């Protein structure tokens, strides 16, 4: 995939719900989950632009009422080739 989807949440439990809602919703790959610091967790998905569009909308709707909530839901249809170096390829 080329499109990036991202859901930031306050806490892991909201983020796991978004990762599940997003990956169930459309053909996107969970490429990373990052603990930013201060209780901010980002879930990142890379797929086609249509799937990433549908996925990120599913995640945002799922995690909004879960736990502390959603900080952000962003789609970047094609990141610059430079931003690829700061993007995870496989979750750890």
């Amino acid at each position: 995939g080329i499109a990036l989807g991202m859901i930031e949440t306050r806490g892991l439990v909201p983020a796991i719900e978004a990762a599940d809602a997003m990956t169930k919703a459309a053909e996107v790959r969970l490429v990373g989950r990052q603990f930013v610091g201060g209780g901010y967790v980002t879930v990142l998905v890379r797929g086609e632009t249509g799937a990433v569009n549908a996925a990120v909308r599913a995640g945002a709707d799922a995690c909004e009422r879960v736990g502390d909530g959603l900080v952000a839901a962003h789609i970047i249809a094609r990141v610059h080739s430079e931003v690829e170096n700061i993007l995870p390829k496989a979750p750890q």
Binding site: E17, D61, A62, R65, V66
Partner: peptide, 14 residues
């Protein structure tokens, strides 16, 4: 995440 929750979704100082 309760099935219902999803279905619907469709102190002292010291």
């Amino acid at each position: 995440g309760t099935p219902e929750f999803r279905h619907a979704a469709r102190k002292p100082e010291l």
